[PDB]
Amino acid sequence: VETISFSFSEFEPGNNDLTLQGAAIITQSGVLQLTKINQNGMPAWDSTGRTLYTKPVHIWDMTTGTVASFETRFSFSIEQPYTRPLPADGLVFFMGPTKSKPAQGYGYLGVFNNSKQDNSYQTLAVEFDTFSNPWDPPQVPHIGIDVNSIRSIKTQPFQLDNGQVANVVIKYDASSKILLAVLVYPSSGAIYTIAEIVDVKQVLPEWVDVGLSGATGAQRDAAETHDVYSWSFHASLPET
Amino acid sequence: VETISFSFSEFEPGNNDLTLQGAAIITQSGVLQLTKINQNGMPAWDSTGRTLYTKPVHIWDMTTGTVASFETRFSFSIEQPYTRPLPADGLVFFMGPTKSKPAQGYGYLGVFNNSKQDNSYQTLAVEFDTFSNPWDPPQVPHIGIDVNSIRSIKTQPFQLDNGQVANVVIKYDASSKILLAVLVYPSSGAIYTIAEIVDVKQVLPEWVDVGLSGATGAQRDAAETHDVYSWSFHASLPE
Numbered sequence: 243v244e245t246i247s248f249s250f251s252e253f254e255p256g257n258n259d260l261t262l263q264g265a266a267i268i269t270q271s272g273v274l275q276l277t278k279i280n281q282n283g284m285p286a287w288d289s290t291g292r293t294l295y296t297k298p299v300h301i302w303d304m305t306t307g308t309v310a311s312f313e314t315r316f317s318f319s320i321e322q323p324y325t326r327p328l329p330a331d332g333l334v335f336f337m338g339p340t341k342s343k344p345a346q347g348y349g350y351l352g353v354f355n356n357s358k359q360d361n362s363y364q365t366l367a368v369e370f371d372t373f374s375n376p377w378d379p380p381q382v383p384h385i386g387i388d389v390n391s392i393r394s395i396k397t398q399p400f401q402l403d404n405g406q407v408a409n410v411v412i413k414y415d416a417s418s419k420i421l422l423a424v425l426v427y428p429s430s431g432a433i434y435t436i437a438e439i440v441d442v443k444q445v446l447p448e449w450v451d452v453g454l455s456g457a458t459g460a461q462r463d464a465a466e467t468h469d470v471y472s473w474s475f476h477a478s479l480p481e482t
Numbered sequence: 483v484e485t486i487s488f489s490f491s492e493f494e495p496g497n498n499d500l501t502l503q504g505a506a507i508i509t510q511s512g513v514l515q516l517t518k519i520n521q522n523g524m525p526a527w528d529s530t531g532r533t534l535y536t537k538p539v540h541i542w543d544m545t546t547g548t549v550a551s552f553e554t555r556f557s558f559s560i561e562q563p564y565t566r567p568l569p570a571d572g573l574v575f576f577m578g579p580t581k582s583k584p585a586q587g588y589g590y591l592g593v594f595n596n597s598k599q600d601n602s603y604q605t606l607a608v609e610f611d612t613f614s615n616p617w618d619p620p621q622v623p624h625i626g627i628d629v630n631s632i633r634s635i636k637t638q639p640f641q642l643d644n645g646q647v648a649n650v651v652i653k654y655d656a657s658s659k660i661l662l663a664v665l666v667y668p669s670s671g672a673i674y675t676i677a678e679i680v681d682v683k684q685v686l687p688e689w690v691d692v693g694l695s696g697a698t699g700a701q702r703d704a705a706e707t708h709d710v711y712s713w714s715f716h717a718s719l720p721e
């Protein structure tokens with residue numbers, strides 16, 4: 243069996259196991275600010291940032307046909323400071339081709355480049371979407387399972403608890419092909435779930451980079467924070 | 483679209499929407515005690531109790547082939563008072579033939595009668611198992627998805643936070659045939675998940691009863707509480 247795992251109880255500046263891209267920075271306090279926080283302490287619009295684990299993950303093997311099961315957990319907080327304009331745009335956990343650089347921002351969350359479901363993306367992602375674009379369901383925010391497209395194969399509306407910490411658990415079982423995501427707000431006790439069938443060997447390349455990405459809006463003050471406090475990941479590829 | 487739903491923020495003695503069976507009692511305080519609590523305040527062993535919603539649920543229609551999606555949520559607490567003997571046996575959310583009575587207790591949790599996987603059970607259940615029987619994985623407690631058998635098709639170990647309230651969410655999506663269960667302990671923030679493919683059309687009858695069941699052990703003091711504080715359910719059958 244081939245396994246890989248990491249766990250950051252808090253983010254460590256300078257720890258090379260993580261790569262920061264775009265606007266992403268890690269504070270001395272250990273918080274990953276995916277999108278820029280201005281000097282005044284407020285979230286900047288037109289910002290896109292990501293972080294990738296620096297070691298590629300072997301998600302499946304074409305020769306043996308084996309597929310890995312994996313799990314990832316993280317705690318994040320989104321703070322929407324203004325009543326108007328509408329906040330944006332969201333944050334997301336993604337898995338895709340190695341050596342990737344940030345893609346388009348805004349509604350594409352730094353992961354996609356359009357609203358097409360293109361197999362060439364070879365990307366799987368679980369989004370926490372705060373702005374309703376033309377391809378989105380009207381309810382925001384919502385959790386979404388994205389398979390080679392920003393247009394989610396399934397969505398689940400959830401109520402934001404402004405500025406509070408949400409705990410996320412995402413798990414993929416290769417035998418059942420079930421991808422599940424759960425969001426819990428300790429503050430209110432709210433629990434949300436979403437799941438769908440995803441055959442990773444039909445979507446992802448054999449080796450992938452895993453990461454987190456966040457993006458704020460296309461107009462002044464159409465923004466919110468996209469802070470992450472912790473992040474763990476584990477994958478196991480059976481020999482079979 | 484045929485829908486049904488209910489929500490008990492707490493339980494009230496006498497409410498006809500719930501049928502109590504076996505040892506099950508609803509306290510004046512609004513707590514559903516699935517298994518007997520002795521007058522000394524401790525859980526009694528050799529106890530089995532359940533509750534069934536008095537309304538029948540239309541889970542699927544053979545004529546149209548339509549299948550319902552559903553979700554249930556409940557809060558419970560299991561308190562294991564002694565270091566020995568080992569605590570037992572657990573509690574479970576189950577769906578199956580209407581107007582049923584309590585099955586075997588102990589490890590069968592008041593839902594099954596043996597450890598065989600018999601289509602005749604026509605029962606789907608999500609267990610919160612506290613005692614490792616011969617047909618069980620070694621670690622306890624564990625969540626388990628049971629399809630016509632107490633020998634779950636999928637299990638997930640979880641740490642008990644003794645006497646604390648656990649929040650459970652069980653959801654079935656008919657389109658994907660995914661049955662998922664989540665357990666969260668607000669006290670510690672711990673989150674556990676389990677999911678598996680279940681084609682309810684192959685397991686359950688068209689109309690089913692939904693309920694909760696709990697059981698304590700076969701030897702003196704091999705027991706624990708099986709208290710439920712709230713329970714909600716919702717199902718929707720397209721067509």
Ligand SMILES: OC[C@H]1O[C@@H](O[C@H]2[C@H](O)[C@@H](O)[C@H](O)O[C@@H]2CO)[C@H](O)[C@@H](O)[C@H]1O
Binds near residue numbers: 329331458459
């Ligand atoms: O407002 C946040 C929202 O902006 C969308 O882009 C808008 C832009 O803000 C508006 O000024 C312009 O007139 O139209 C654009 C749409 O074509 C983003 O697309 C959306 O993702 C959010 O970022």
Ligand SMILES: OC[C@H]1O[C@@H](O[C@H]2[C@H](O)[C@@H](O)[C@H](O)O[C@@H]2CO)[C@H](O)[C@@H](O)[C@H]1O
Binds near residue numbers: 568588589590699700
């Ligand atoms: O001890 C709790 C445990 O008991 C099992 O039954 C035992 C019984 O307790 C023991 O005294 C007897 O000698 O053997 C029985 C089984 O081999 C139950 O089966 C189990 O579910 C728990 O309730």
Ligand SMILES: [Ca+2]
Binds near residue numbers: 332374
């Ligand atoms: Ca969006």
Ligand SMILES: [Ca+2]
Binds near residue numbers: 571613614615618
């Ligand atoms: Ca057992």
Ligand SMILES: [Mn+2]
Binds near residue numbers: 369371378386394
């Ligand atoms: Mn979306």
Ligand SMILES: [Mn+2]
Binds near residue numbers: 624626
């Ligand atoms: Mn079991």
